[PDB]
Amino acid sequence: SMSVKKPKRDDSKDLALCSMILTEMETHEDAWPFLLPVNLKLVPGYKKVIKKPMDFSTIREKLSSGQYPNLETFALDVRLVFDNCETFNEDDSDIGRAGHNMRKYFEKKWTDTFKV
Numbered sequence: 001s002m003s004v005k006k007p008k009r010d011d012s013k014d015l016a017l018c019s020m021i022l023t024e025m026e027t028h029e030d031a032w033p034f035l036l037p038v039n040l041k042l043v044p045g046y047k048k049v050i051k052k053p054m055d056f057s058t059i060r061e062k063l064s065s066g067q068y069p070n071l072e073t074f075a076l077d078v079r080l081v082f083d084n085c086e087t088f089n090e091d092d093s094d095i096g097r098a099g100h101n102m103r104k105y106f107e108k109k110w111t112d113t114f115k116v
């Protein structure tokens with residue numbers, strides 16, 4: 001509260017660290033469904049059903065232009081990619097499995113990088 005402040009972590013490297021994690025995501029062989037925005041003109045249903053589309057290239061653009069206030073807002077957008085994927089894809093499909101794999105991959109790197 002006012003004048004009562006928690007000792008707060010050094011957030012100086014967060015921008016660089018998030019960029020590194022995003023690069024690792026993008027180079028994963030199962031990243032291909034997520035590298036570019038879903039084509040809203042070519043995929044029936046997607047625009048109407050998925051209220052907040054997100055993909056790795058859009059996250060990169062947001063990250064590089066100072067549009068994430070903090071690392072938590074970055075994590076939310078990454079998770080949104082996989083939540084959208086779950087909403088629109090059967091678990092028993094290539095993209096369905098890709099989404100599962102990539103979420104697991106992310107969460108470990110997230111834990112390994114930031115939870116001391």
Ligand SMILES: CC(=O)n1cc(N(C(=O)c2cccc(C(F)(F)F)c2)c2cc(O)ccc2C)c2ccccc21
Nearest residue numbers: 032033034035036037038039040043084085088089095
């Ligand atoms: C995440 C997710 O659920 N999906 C992603 C899809 N997808 C496209 O919409 C897409 C976008 C641009 C070009 C191309 C193409 F070059 F392949 F034609 C495909 C996609 C497909 C790919 O093979 C590779 C990359 C992307 C972004 C997509 C398509 C249908 C249903 C869910 C989808």
